[PDB]
């Protein structure tokens, strides 16, 4: 493994909002495949259904659009119509209470899902352990 194995509690029974404390935004995948963050809890694109591939590995799917969260070769987040290797994330516990999502494909590079204070997604290589941008809190829909 390239990473630790502290896991968050809870299941994938219900859909969730993925709230980032960094700028107080909710992760969002727009219908056009665009990914970003919004402070609008009423948004129709912030609801996700997480599912486990293997223990600690998840798919994050838009319940509105059915699109999967994915990270490309250049570290950019995008919504994928079909599940692929770029859609798998290592879901881990961080700072004892938050959730982090590490790109499985790029795990050795420590590329995470993360949001800037301005609600914009971070590019893989600009992310790293220790940042606030990588911390998510799964909230009820």
């Amino acid at each position: 493994h390239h990473h630790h194995f502290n896991l968050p509690p809870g299941n994938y029974k219900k859909p969730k909002l993925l709230y980032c404390s960094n700028g107080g935004h909710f992760l969002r995948i727009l219908p056009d495949g665009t990914v970003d963050g919004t402070r609008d809890r009423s948004d129709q694109h912030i609801q996700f259904q997480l599912s486990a591939e293997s223990v600690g590995e998840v798919y994050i799917k838009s319940t509105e659009t059915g699109q999967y969260l994915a990270m490309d070769t250049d570290g950019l987040l995008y919504g994928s119509q079909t599940p692929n290797e770029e859609c798998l994330f290592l879901e881990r516990l961080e700072e004892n209470h938050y959730n982090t999502y590490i790109s499985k494909k790029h795990a050795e590079k420590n590329w995470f899902v993360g949001l800037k204070k301005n609600g914009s997604c971070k590019r893989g290589p600009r992310t790293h352990y220790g940042q606030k941008a990588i911390l998510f809190l799964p909230l009820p829909v």
Side-chain angles (χ1 to χ4, degrees), residues 1-12 14-141:
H1 281 143
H2 291 286
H3 303 267
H4 70 102
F5 212 66
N6 294 289
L7 309 172
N11 52 121
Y12 310 109
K14 310 152 231 285
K16 299 278 168 315
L17 312 187
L18 292 169
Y19 172 91
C20 182
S21 59
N22 196 33
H25 297 88
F26 296 105
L27 188 61
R28 178 171 65 168
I29 309 182
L30 295 163
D32 66 7
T34 285
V35 189
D36 69 356
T38 181
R39 297 207 175 81
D40 177 23
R41 201 173 144 143
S42 68
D43 190 286
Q44 283 320 280
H45 302 114
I46 54 168
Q47 303 76 11
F48 305 99
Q49 174 67 65
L50 288 70
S51 71
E53 185 46 56
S54 294
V55 176
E57 299 185 343
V58 301
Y59 283 111
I60 302 166
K61 180 185 91 27
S62 171
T63 65
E64 179 72 25
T65 71
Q67 297 171 91
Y68 291 90
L69 183 70
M71 184 177 280
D72 73 30
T73 193
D74 280 314
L76 297 179
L77 293 179
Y78 70 97
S80 185
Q81 278 304 109
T82 72
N84 61 46
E85 94 176 328
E86 301 184 337
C87 300
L88 263 213
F89 296 85
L90 304 180
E91 177 189 62
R92 294 285 174 284
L93 185 68
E94 189 55 272
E95 290 180 17
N96 301 90
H97 307 117
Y98 295 91
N99 280 20
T100 56
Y101 294 90
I102 292 169
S103 155
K104 185 188 176 157
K105 175 147 189 103
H106 307 281
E108 58 304 339
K109 302 196 275 266
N110 300 10
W111 285 6
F112 299 77
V113 164
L115 295 175
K116 300 179 49 67
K117 287 187 190 72
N118 63 16
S120 78
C121 292
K122 278 189 73 97
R123 199 171 66 95
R126 302 312 180 225
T127 67
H128 58 267
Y129 270 119
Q131 296 178 326
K132 264 5 146 204
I134 65 181
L135 309 171
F136 292 85
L137 187 70
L139 308 181
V141 165

